[PDB]
Design an enzyme around this catalytic site. Structure first.
Site, PDB file in Angstrom:
ATOM      1  N   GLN D  15      -7.779 -56.050  62.710  1.00  0.00           N
ATOM      2  CA  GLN D  15      -7.397 -55.292  61.527  1.00  0.00           C
ATOM      3  C   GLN D  15      -8.597 -54.977  60.648  1.00  0.00           C
ATOM      4  O   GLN D  15      -8.645 -53.904  60.038  1.00  0.00           O
ATOM      5  CB  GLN D  15      -6.336 -56.057  60.742  1.00  0.00           C
ATOM      6  CG  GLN D  15      -4.925 -55.824  61.240  1.00  0.00           C
ATOM      7  CD  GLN D  15      -3.936 -56.824  60.691  1.00  0.00           C
ATOM      8  OE1 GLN D  15      -2.977 -57.198  61.364  1.00  0.00           O
ATOM      9  NE2 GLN D  15      -4.157 -57.263  59.462  1.00  0.00           N
ATOM     10  N   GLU D  64      -2.514 -62.244  71.558  1.00  0.00           N
ATOM     11  CA  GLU D  64      -1.345 -61.501  71.125  1.00  0.00           C
ATOM     12  C   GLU D  64      -1.552 -60.015  71.397  1.00  0.00           C
ATOM     13  O   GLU D  64      -2.680 -59.519  71.433  1.00  0.00           O
ATOM     14  CB  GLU D  64      -1.103 -61.746  69.636  1.00  0.00           C
ATOM     15  CG  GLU D  64       0.138 -61.113  69.048  1.00  0.00           C
ATOM     16  CD  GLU D  64       0.101 -61.103  67.532  1.00  0.00           C
ATOM     17  OE1 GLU D  64      -0.584 -61.969  66.946  1.00  0.00           O
ATOM     18  OE2 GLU D  64       0.745 -60.223  66.925  1.00  0.00           O
ATOM     19  N   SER D 133     -11.264 -64.445  62.584  1.00  0.00           N
ATOM     20  CA  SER D 133     -10.701 -65.292  61.549  1.00  0.00           C
ATOM     21  C   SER D 133     -11.144 -66.733  61.736  1.00  0.00           C
ATOM     22  O   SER D 133     -11.329 -67.210  62.857  1.00  0.00           O
ATOM     23  CB  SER D 133      -9.178 -65.230  61.566  1.00  0.00           C
ATOM     24  OG  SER D 133      -8.628 -66.183  60.676  1.00  0.00           O
ATOM     25  N   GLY D 137      -6.535 -70.113  65.925  1.00  0.00           N
ATOM     26  CA  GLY D 137      -5.898 -69.380  66.994  1.00  0.00           C
ATOM     27  C   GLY D 137      -6.922 -68.778  67.926  1.00  0.00           C
ATOM     28  O   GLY D 137      -7.730 -69.493  68.523  1.00  0.00           O
ATOM     29  N   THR D 172      -2.641 -69.749  54.508  1.00  0.00           N
ATOM     30  CA  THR D 172      -1.535 -69.168  55.248  1.00  0.00           C
ATOM     31  C   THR D 172      -1.161 -69.958  56.487  1.00  0.00           C
ATOM     32  O   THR D 172      -0.150 -69.637  57.119  1.00  0.00           O
ATOM     33  CB  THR D 172      -1.863 -67.730  55.662  1.00  0.00           C
ATOM     34  OG1 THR D 172      -3.056 -67.722  56.451  1.00  0.00           O
ATOM     35  CG2 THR D 172      -2.067 -66.872  54.445  1.00  0.00           C
ATOM     36  N   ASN D 199     -10.318 -64.481  51.429  1.00  0.00           N
ATOM     37  CA  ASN D 199      -9.255 -63.594  50.979  1.00  0.00           C
ATOM     38  C   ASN D 199      -9.009 -63.753  49.486  1.00  0.00           C
ATOM     39  O   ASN D 199      -8.813 -62.764  48.773  1.00  0.00           O
ATOM     40  CB  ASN D 199      -7.987 -63.877  51.774  1.00  0.00           C
ATOM     41  CG  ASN D 199      -8.140 -63.540  53.235  1.00  0.00           C
ATOM     42  OD1 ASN D 199      -8.150 -64.420  54.093  1.00  0.00           O
ATOM     43  ND2 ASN D 199      -8.269 -62.256  53.528  1.00  0.00           N
ATOM     44  N   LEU D 245     -31.342 -55.689  62.160  1.00  0.00           N
ATOM     45  CA  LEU D 245     -30.448 -56.834  62.277  1.00  0.00           C
ATOM     46  C   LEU D 245     -31.190 -58.100  62.665  1.00  0.00           C
ATOM     47  O   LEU D 245     -30.779 -59.200  62.281  1.00  0.00           O
ATOM     48  CB  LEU D 245     -29.352 -56.538  63.294  1.00  0.00           C
ATOM     49  CG  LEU D 245     -28.070 -55.963  62.705  1.00  0.00           C
ATOM     50  CD1 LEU D 245     -28.383 -54.771  61.834  1.00  0.00           C
ATOM     51  CD2 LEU D 245     -27.120 -55.581  63.805  1.00  0.00           C
ATOM     52  N   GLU D 247     -33.974 -58.977  61.549  1.00  0.00           N
ATOM     53  CA  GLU D 247     -34.726 -59.465  60.401  1.00  0.00           C
ATOM     54  C   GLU D 247     -33.928 -60.467  59.582  1.00  0.00           C
ATOM     55  O   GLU D 247     -34.515 -61.351  58.948  1.00  0.00           O
ATOM     56  CB  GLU D 247     -35.150 -58.294  59.520  1.00  0.00           C
ATOM     57  CG  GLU D 247     -35.874 -57.199  60.274  1.00  0.00           C
ATOM     58  CD  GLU D 247     -36.454 -56.139  59.365  1.00  0.00           C
ATOM     59  OE1 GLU D 247     -36.326 -56.273  58.131  1.00  0.00           O
ATOM     60  OE2 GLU D 247     -37.039 -55.165  59.883  1.00  0.00           O
TER      61      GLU D 247
END
Ligand SMILES: Nc1nc2c(ncn2[C@@H]2O[C@H](COP(=O)(O)OP(=O)(O)OP(=O)(O)O)[C@@H](O)[C@H]2O)c(=O)[nH]1
Ligand SMILES: Nc1nc2c(ncn2[C@@H]2O[C@H](COP(=O)(O)OP(=O)(O)OP(=O)(O)O)[C@@H](O)[C@H]2O)c(=O)[nH]1
Ligand SMILES: Nc1nc2c(ncn2[C@@H]2O[C@H](COP(=O)(O)OP(=O)(O)O)[C@@H](O)[C@H]2O)c(=O)[nH]1
Ligand SMILES: Nc1nc2c(ncn2[C@@H]2O[C@H](COP(=O)(O)OP(=O)(O)O)[C@@H](O)[C@H]2O)c(=O)[nH]1
Ligand SMILES: [Mg+2]
Ligand SMILES: [Mg+2]
Lengths: 432, 430, 430, 432
Positions: D15, D64, D133, D137, D172, D199, D245, D247
């Protein structure tokens, strides 16, 4: 000038042939008949007549008469010469003995005559293309009978055969190990190069790469049709670096008894997912060496390569071909046998593969067909010999074979020969 | 006078030759129909070196095209500058060689060689003064390696005194295009070292580098490579066709380039070579042309001269130049790289200057170098050949055509001796 | 004659160099397309000092652009005066250095340095008389600090006698732009003190002051800073390119400016510098130009000369001037600031006067000062370096690329010795 | 020339990726497909095909198949290559063991192959961008499984990961402490630099500075999308002082085990209240050091800074950047560790950030993204370890983890490693 005589044996060969000759007619502008509408290199496969009718240079032979009877009623009824299509009284009934000793003896003298009437009609004879099944019946007995007859009438002429090798797990007949070994024992000394394919392997490819959950036999044949077109594209079309059927024998067969290459065809891609692919030469060349794309369910990395023929088509630059092969040679996972520093034979053709309407392959720009001889196929022979050993130990189905012209001893001689061949594959794969 | 007769072989020779005759016809003003429409009369004065004349201004190349398969020439005659050749010169069989030297030399080409000779003698006998024979082929194939060496032996036995120069494509070290290359190369070389005067070794991999690095070509076809080979083949035979301040005949090069009879393998080069975008950043003068001529990155052979020493060198310049510059540059190269030149040869450079440059170029130069570093090429092939031969990798395809294993051993021994000889003369006096 | 070959490095060098070649091309009348359209013929007489000639009046800079990343040069070639450079001179890799000296010097640049040298030698060998090499880079980066010093060592080992001058951007004291600056600076300086003849130390913070204070510029881009650096780089090489009442060759400066071998770090300057609104309130004459040249606020290095003493000084004037004024002013400066000049050097000023000024200016001057106050810069870096090194702040990024902790200690010891030497010669006789 | 392979793991990564690739397509004129209308620096993220279709250089992987199945039906269905989107049978069910030992083993060999087909297609490989995340999971087990696989196949290549670190109060899932520690223990030695976001912290920013009382996950992702664009803007666009990147590794990671920078993005301002703001360089630079604008709910002033990367964009003058950083260095409240006198890495880019239509951020002129490594994050690890200690002391949920491929010991080894890391953060923060 060049020529190729196509002999199609059994239901597999006849049905594979239906796809081959639907492709050739499409590759030459032919109109499902011998007619060409109101287109010049066909001469390698099609004989020409003053009527404007082009006659395929093929022989369809079967002891059963249902598959060929369908051709005579099909769309290509008026293409083949009626005497090319040879049908018998009763099939071989999955029995090698019937195909080789009892029923084959009554047709072999008929197919061989029609071959003769074709061999002498060619400006120059190049070789024979044999399509047949390895499961058994006509494909196992009749072919080994026909192969021995061609070996004497034509001697050194090239004899290439396309075999539907039995799959490891999938099977459709119970006596395949008997037929597979018996035909192999009688074809080692009479065959030059046998290209192997498995139904299971193409089944994986047809759903894993082509997005189809319902492959019929038509789908598999159309995939095999592309391969044979690529193999014979050099004769049929112009290219930068051509290759002739007699070149495969020396390039792929290091030893007389080790002549069983695998087969591959890289750009087997769905039309929809082709929009997200560059399909450049280096990537398709790498796909040929992946176990996920082999047309025989034998893993190359379980063994060592011994020879490779890369037959490119379409828009291909020989500089790219040089680079891609160079990188592949660098990879350590891709292992070649030490005694073959020169590992690759290369062929480049300018004709892009043509897509059959109603087919599944995408309208690719460039394609490569790879014909690799590997020691990995030794595992398949060992697996096949194990299945034969189990059945024969119990004499599971011997009474059928012994009672139709064969003999008990031939089972022992055929199996020991396969043991020697399996031993030979081991000696070739070891150095110092 | 001093006519050259061109012989083809295999697909490689026929493809290279078709491009050579397009280039030659361009600098002589010969249309694809055979008519002459050049502007300068000089290009017509010595047109007899390669072309025969006919009624109506038609000029016919003194070329012999041969292959064991007609597919290749049918492409040649169908393509541009294909109708130029005399139809009777297309001598071919029906069944090709399967990339095996045995078939082309003993079995398939043996029965067809006589047909070729009957055309060669007819072509040669029409020459007022025959200079030599020019053969284009490949050592990795079957027709070129087998039949091409069979022709070489036949002509050398029939024209012992004439010069025979071969422009042979050599298998590359990086990647092969034929699994049996070591057998074809070793057997073919066994014949070349005895029956030819000057062999120009080239390999595709090197030409791939030149197109990629120097010309910055992103889509190099075989036409581009063959043009490079054509330019060097045109260069070494320009003094015979055009005047210059200092001329160099084919025998003039062979005398200056071949100290010992068997060391006659050359690695050619060419200059200038620049991309389409880098042309406006170059002076295009003698000092730089001579600079990239000796650059190992601009040579059409895999072997790098830095790994060995130059026995001799030739620099056939083209275009109007200052003779002072040419000699000073060659001397300048000689002084700086004194380690790269064998010492028991006081002067290692043979120079020539033709007056007429190739079309579209004000200046040009062709480099020819006989270097002991070439021993790497043959040693590499020896390693591959002995690897396969150690366990009868593919012999049955050869011994079945009439060969014998003894010939395989003799070929390897001869190649090893040549490698030894090249190494031996790489050491200084005493 | 007396040709200079320009070498770039990193993003800093490539950005500075692109501006230097725009300024140089401006005073020689060279269009961005390479054609010459100058008015005075004098700017064309010595154009060979930096430019090579080609057909059609095209002039090609003798510049070598190198970086471990092509993003910077792709900006260079896409921008103005980018098509001028010879495409073959853009030598670059794919994976850049992560602002670490180890990667640029040992791992990433090591495999690419040979490609650069092959271009440097080709450029140098085209010079009738090679004066020296000119390198632009930064000590705080990875490519410039690591690869730039690797090139310096390679060229010095290959051209021992030629003069090598470096225009290096030094990390500022106020704020940093790279967390590992002390490691890059210390390691880079360890190489410079041994393998270069004259290093022109500059830092952005000082140029920020000049734009803010003197020029009164409210939106100073890096283009404005690079123009300032360009002007001083053009100044020190004007005698080679234009005539004057008194000339100063690069070796002429090095002899007069470097008493001891290791004290070759200079802090440049420039004049006149005035805002757009303050131009109508200035005389624009020698007395004032010399006045702001020695002003500590007008120097392109952080270190203030008031904290130390001038070992030597150079004043390369431009434009037609009274030689009497120039000598009187330099003597006037010498008398007033006698405390600022070392006493065991009777005369601490080297003077030169070029006849042609920069475009749009009637007069100009470039100041070069070798001052013991520079010891502050190195001492400050030593304090930062030892702070991080005391507890292995970032070593694993360096030791993992091939370096070793011993080299870190050696670099610090060498820098401390140089600081000691600068301090030692700041004391009067006995 | 440059390249970046984006691997998106789990629902969070997938997402978050949806927002990233909606921004990149907008930053390059792309039209929600691979097509560009009738736009040249895309090559760093988008592969190109002869059809005019640009294919994102990303891999979407999830056990999933509901989130990815929504992409295939979304507006970007025809953007990604169908084989890039990898979906499994059954999710990891908030269990690290399932993601790492049981289900991951059945997909890792598939995602790794598609990564291989991308790595070899790049002119030069720069590094990997990992989105996942931290809650657990797939994001905790699969990533640590994938990270170890990339560490061996690609060795020293840069591996940057964007982690949704657990919030202090908001949660969560009930087993986050188990997953957070287990993944961290297996990613310390295989990750180069992990950028953390919470979050809760973005929730505060979205209402405190953007005037929105109803932030969805789309809003948070669009904020994270800007950050990644800024990090990779140097590769994608031209600038005065670029940064690569590779660096970040040396500039931000003083020690191998301390590679957890925070994140910030200063001009997070509502469109309406932007009319009353000058938005000059000095002010936005100061906003980065305020606890009110951190994207991780960890207070910087509770600890000492160790490294900072200021990546400016748009209309920015390097003189202003010099001044602003100079003043910030002067402030005593903003404390840097003593052993790092050189505290800042600076990067300036000419491309102003682009605003997504329907988004919330204002049409800012210039923006700065700050990536700071601080000892304050040691508090978060200590808090996380306390939660793990409470649960594990009771073996609150152990039976789920032990019974799906893991073992009891790994809980002890993972926790003690976190104790050592917390100890290490203390040693680094003390001098003499
Ligand atoms: N690829 C492909 N394989 C086929 C096809 N038809 C049959 N086969 C293979 O043929 C094998 C068995 O040999 P068959 O061709 O069926 O038997 P036969 O050659 O007609 O000999 P008989 O037993 O006497 O009928 C099976 O295992 C199939 O895998 C086909 O249409 N396509
Ligand atoms: N910023 C942001 N965070 C998200 C989003 N979706 C999920 N998360 C975070 O992901 C954390 C839990 O990990 P998940 O991604 O939901 O689980 P997973 O990675 O799919 O692994 P499984 O448990 O097997 O499904 C939650 O605590 C959320 O904070 C999102 O769309 N945006
Ligand atoms: N440059 C060039 N090389 C070729 C061409 N055709 C074949 N070759 C080379 O020739 C070798 C193959 O042998 P080939 O000549 O085709 O076999 P033959 O026909 O029996 O002589 C390979 O090494 C090819 O690289 C061509 O058109 N151009
Ligand atoms: N004046 C100026 N200084 C620069 C420029 N680019 C980078 N720098 C300086 O160079 C240092 C950064 O090192 P850099 O050269 O970018 O790393 P490199 O590419 O590996 O050499 C910083 O101190 C910058 O101040 C520029 O365009 N102009
Ligand atoms: Mg049947
Ligand atoms: Mg999930």
């Amino acid at each position: 000038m060049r020529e190729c005589i196509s002999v199609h044996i059994g239901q597999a060969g006849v049905q594979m042939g239906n796809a081959c000759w639907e492709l050739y007619c499409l590759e030459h502008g032919i109109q499902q008949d011998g007619i060409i509408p109101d287109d010049s290199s066909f001469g390698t496969f099609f004989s020409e007549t003053g009527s404007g009718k082009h006659v395929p240079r093929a022989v369809f032979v079967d002891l059963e008469q249902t598959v060929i009877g369908e051709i005579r009623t099909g769309h290509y009824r008026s293409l083949f010469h009626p005497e090319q299509l040879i049908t018998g009284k009763e099939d071989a009934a999955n029995n090698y003995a019937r195909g080789h000793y009892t029923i084959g003896k009554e047709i072999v003298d008929s197919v061989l005559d029609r071959v003769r009437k074709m061999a002498d009609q060619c400006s120059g004879l190049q070789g024979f293309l044999i399509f047949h099944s390895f499961g058994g019946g006509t494909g196992s007995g009749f072919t080994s009978l026909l192969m021995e007859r061609l070996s004497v009438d034509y001697g050194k002429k090239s004899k290439l055969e396309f075999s539907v090798y039995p799959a490891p797990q999938i099977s459709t007949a119970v006596v395949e190990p008997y037929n597979s070994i018996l035909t192999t024992h009688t074809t080692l000394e009479h065959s030059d190069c046998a290209f192997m394919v498995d139904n299971e392997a193409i089944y994986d490819i047809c759903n894993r790469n082509l997005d189809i959950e319902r492959p019929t036999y038509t789908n598999l044949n159309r995939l095999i049709g592309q391969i044979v077109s690529s193999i014979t594209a050099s004769l049929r079309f112009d290219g930068a670096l051509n290759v002739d059927l007699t070149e495969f024998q020396t390039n792929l067969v290091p030893y007389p008894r080790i002549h069983f290459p695998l087969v591959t065809y890289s750009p087997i891609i769905s039309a929809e997912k082709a929009y997200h692919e560059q399909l450049s030469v280096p990537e398709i060349t790498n796909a040929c060496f992946e176990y996920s794309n082999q047309m025989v369910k034998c893993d190359p990395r379980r063994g060592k390569y011994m020879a490779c023929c890369l037959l490119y088509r379409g828009d291909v630059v020989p500089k790219d071909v040089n680079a891609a092969i160079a990188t592949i040679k660098t990879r350590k996972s891709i292992q070649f046998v030490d005694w073959c520093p020169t590992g690759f034979k290369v062929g480049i053709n300018y004709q892009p593969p043509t897509a059959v309407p109603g087919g599944d392959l995408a309208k690719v720009q460039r394609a490569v067909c790879m014909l690799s001889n590997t020691t990995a196929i030794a595992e398949a022979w060992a697996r096949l010999d194990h299945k034969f050993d189990l059945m024969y130990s119990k004499r599971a189905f011997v009474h059928w074979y012994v009672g139709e012209g064969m003999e008990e001893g031939e089972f022992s001689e055929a199996r020991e020969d396969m043991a020697a061949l399996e031993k030979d594959y081991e000696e070739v794969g070891t150095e110092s | 006078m001093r006519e050259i007769v061109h012989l083809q072989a295999g697909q490689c020779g026929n493809q290279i030759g078709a491009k050579f005759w397009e280039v030659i016809s361009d600098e002589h003003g010969i249309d694809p129909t055979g008519a002459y429409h050049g502007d300068s009369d000089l290009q017509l004065e010595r047109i007899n070196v390669y072309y025969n004349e006919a009624t109506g201004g038609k000029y016919v190349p003194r070329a012999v095209l041969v292959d064991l398969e007609p597919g290749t020439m049918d492409s040649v005659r169908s393509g541009p500058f294909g109708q130029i050749f005399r139809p009777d010169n297309f001598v071919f069989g029906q069944s090709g060689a399967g990339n095996n030297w045995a078939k082309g030399h003993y079995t398939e080409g043996a029965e067809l060689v006589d047909s070729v000779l009957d055309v060669v003698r007819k072509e040669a006998e029409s020459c007022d003064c025959l200079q030599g024979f020019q053969l284009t082929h490949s050592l990795g194939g079957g027709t070129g390696s087998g039949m091409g060496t069979l022709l070489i032996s036949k002509i050398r036995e029939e024209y012992p005194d004439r010069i025979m120069n071969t422009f042979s494509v050599v298998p590359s070290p990086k990647v092969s295009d034929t699994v049996v290359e070591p057998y074809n190369a070793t057997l073919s070389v066994h014949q070349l070292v005895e029956n030819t005067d000057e062999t120009y070794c080239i390999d595709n991999e090197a030409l791939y580098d030149i197109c990629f690095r120097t010309l910055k070509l992103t889509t190099p076809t075989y036409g581009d490579l063959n043009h490079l080979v054509s330019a060097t083949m045109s260069g070494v035979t320009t003094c015979l066709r055009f005047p210059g301040q200092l001329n160099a005949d084919l025998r003039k090069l062979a005398v200056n380039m071949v100290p010992f009879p068997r060391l006659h393998f050359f690695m050619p080069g060419f200059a200038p070579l620049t991309s389409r975008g880098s042309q406006q950043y170059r002076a295009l003068t003698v000092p730089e042309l001579t600079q990239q001529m000796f650059d190992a990155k601009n040579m059409m052979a895999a072997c790098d001269p830095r790994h060995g020493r130059y026995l001799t060198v030739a620099a056939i310049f083209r275009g109007r130049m200052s003779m002072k510059e040419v000699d000073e540059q060659m001397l300048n190269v000689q002084n700086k790289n004194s380690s790269y030149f064998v010492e028991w040869i006081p002067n290692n450079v043979k120079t020539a200057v033709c007056d007429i440059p190739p079309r579209g170029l004000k200046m040009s130069a062709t480099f020819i170098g006989n270097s002991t570093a070439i021993q790497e090429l043959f040693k590499r092939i020896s390693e591959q050949f002995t690897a396969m031969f150690r366990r009868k990798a593919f012999l049955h395809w050869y011994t079945g055509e009439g060969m014998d294993e003894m010939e395989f051993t003799e070929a390897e021994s001869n190649m090893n001796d040549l490698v030894s000889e090249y190494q031996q003369y790489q050491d200084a006096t005493a």
